[PDB]
């Protein structure tokens, strides 16, 4: 689609370019960080739940504090530059300085001397210390995705966009995110399949990493250039933007509740409680399967080039399925089949594509022999099923799960509406991710490996989807009742 007028073009094209560059970098780094962490020497998918908690969220709080104290000393555009340019500096220094020195910075000797002491479940924790530059890459990719996408760009947009433009501009950005998924997938596939220079002695992944980070640097430079252009040619034009507009809404400056003044609001009434249960269950269910799926990827694609090429193809097909969804099942299913079915499609889809995946992962030897008669191994079949599950979730999230969340936010009174919305999006925004990481950390420490914890992940996934299904079924009763009295 292209639902933007002709006069708003000069304002939206720099915005669309900024969003395209930011999402392109986000996808490239999201795939490259998994490639680096999972394919590292002495590392694997077990390092992912340890990073995502013991490095991502403390660095997240550190960066949020630095940003909050920096916004008061720098101007808005100077703040954007001072936050975005360190990212580009790191992504230019990584493949040129930090990755070539990865056999000098990484303390492999101390790392294995430590691993010989810690329990075998802390292999994912000693893989952080063994690959601490790859861990810094993971942290900074997560911080790109958080800061430069959700905080920086979206604050810029919500500040400079008009309310009468916001819906169309955000729909255009939603379709541009899928177009950038397509582009970043093709670019990662190309940079990975560029396993050229047959003359050995060079790192085949070194060239791919140089190409990926070079595309990232060019995209970040185009981002900075479009930001400068929209500041010097648009945000100073009294026709597109005027700071006399958002002051009305900023009179009541955003009162972000800390954690627990909302943890009690999640206990005020069963409505917001069940909605928080839905969000938390989604956040945990999406994370529970990803670590096992990435272990299966490390098994199927040992070297970093094939892993990154699969991640590129996976991003490309996530983009394809996202475009198909946004074009066909955009707002169809919710209004066609009620709120309960729209809220239940995602849990039952995760349930089906997760029990199949965990059956292929647990019953490998039982399946290898029946699947072998179909040309594939249960490892490749589990990889495919996990990729299908991830694609379906990341595709019909924005159209099936978020669309039912916000639809449930409707029949509430404005006070409880905004307060409970803030409560959910302040606690369960990570609570789910951090909990899905902590569950996997505990299961790795207790069980001892990823292959040994997968029978317990399936039981936990069934115990959470059961909560997800029962809470969505109960929330549908309080959603249908309150909607009827709101009519009169």
């Amino acid at each position, epitope marked *: 689609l292209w639902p933007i007028h002709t006069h708003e073009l000069k304002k939206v094209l720099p915005m669309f370019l900024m969003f395209f560059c930011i999402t392109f970098n986000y996808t490239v780094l999201r795939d490259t960080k998994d490639t680096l962490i999972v394919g590292a020497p002495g590392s694997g998918a077990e390092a992912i739940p340890f990073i995502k908690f013991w490095l991502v969220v403390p660095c997240a709080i550190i960066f949020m504090l630095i940003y909050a104290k920096l916004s008061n000393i720098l101007s808005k555009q100077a703040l954007f530059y001072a936050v975005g340019t360190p990212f580009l500096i790191f992504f230019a220094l990584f493949p040129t300085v930090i990755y070539p020195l990865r056999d000098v910075l990484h303390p492999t000797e101390f790392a294995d001397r430590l691993q010989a002491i810690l329990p075998p479940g802390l292999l994912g924790l000693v893989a952080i210390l063994r690959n601490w530059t790859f861990a810094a890459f993971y942290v900074l990719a997560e911080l790109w995705g958080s800061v430069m996408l959700s905080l920086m760009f979206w604050g810029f947009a919500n500040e400079i966009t008009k309310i009468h433009e916001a819906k169309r501009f955000y729909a255009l950005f939603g379709i541009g995110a899928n177009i950038s998924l397509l582009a970043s997938g093709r670019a990662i596939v190309w940079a990975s399949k560029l396993r050229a220079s047959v003359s050995e002695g060079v790192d085949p992944w070194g060239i791919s990493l140089r190409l990926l980070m070079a595309m990232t640097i060019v995209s970040g430079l185009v981002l900075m250039a479009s930001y400068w252009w929209i500041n010097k040619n648009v945000l100073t034009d009294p026709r597109f933007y005027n700071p006399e507009e958002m002051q009305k809404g900023k009179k009541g400056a955003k009162p972000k509740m800390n954690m627990k003044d909302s943890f009690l609001y999640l206990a005020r009434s069963p409505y917001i409680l069940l909605l928080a249960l839905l969000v938390i269950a989604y956040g945990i269910c999406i994370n529970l399967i990803e670590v096992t799926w990435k272990s299966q990827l490390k098994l199927q694609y040992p070297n970093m080039n094939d892993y990154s090429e699969f991640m590129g193809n996976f991003s490309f097909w996530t983009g394809v399925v996202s475009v198909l969804i946004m074009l066909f099942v955009g707002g169809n299913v919710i209004r066609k089949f009620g709120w309960l079915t729209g809220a239940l499609v995602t849990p039952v889809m995760v349930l089906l594509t997760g029990i199949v995946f965990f059956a292929l992962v647990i019953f490998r*030897n039982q399946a290898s*022999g029946l699947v*072998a*008669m179909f*040309g594939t191994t249960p490892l490749m079949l589990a990889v495919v099923v996990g990729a299908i599950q991830n694609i379906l979730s990341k595709s019909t999230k924005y159209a099936l799960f978020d669309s039912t969340k916000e639809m449930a936010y409707i029949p509430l009174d404005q006070e409880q509406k905004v307060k409970g919305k803030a409560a959910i999006d302040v606690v369960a925004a990570r609570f789910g991710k951090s909990g899905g990481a902590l569950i996997q950390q505990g299961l790795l420490v207790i069980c001892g490996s990823i292959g040994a914890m997968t029978p317990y992940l399936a039981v936990i996934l069934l115990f959470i989807i059961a909560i997800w299904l029962v809470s969505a079924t109960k929330l549908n009763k309080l959603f249908l009742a309150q909607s009827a009295l709101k009519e009169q």
Partner: nanobody, 118 residues
């Protein structure tokens, strides 16, 4: 009806070679997915190799990859399995399996026993 029968089992030595046969009958051989399995006494039946429909796609077990090669002949109805560099771990009764083009269960032969330098 779906009679499968194996041939070529026996013994050579630890590191020898053998060529199994699957001279089947009773179905459209050009439209069936064949393959070879084995079941040592006390172990579970594992697969050795499968041949797609014409020889394009072959899937070997990671324990026999490179050593064994599976080949069919849609004209001369028979599935072959050329076994080379036989290890003492290879001793078992080798079954030939056959799945139709759209079915989901594989018919099994009586199986031929292969032993190598006990």
């Amino acid at each position: 009806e779906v009679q499968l029968v194996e041939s070529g089992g026996g013994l050579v030595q630890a590191g020898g070679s053998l060529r199994l046969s699957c001279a089947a009958s009773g179905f459209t051989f050009s439209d069936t997915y064949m393959g070879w399995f084995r079941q040592a006494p006390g172990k579970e039946r594992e697969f050795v190799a499968t041949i797609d429909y014409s020889g394009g796609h072959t899937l070997y077990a990671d324990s026999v990859k490179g050593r064994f090669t599976i080949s069919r002949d849609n004209s001369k109805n028979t599935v072959y399995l050329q076994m080379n560099s036989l290890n003492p771990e290879d001793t078992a009764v080798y079954y030939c399996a056959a799945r139709k083009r759209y079915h989901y269960y594989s018919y099994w032969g009586q199986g031929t026993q292969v032993t190598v330098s006990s």
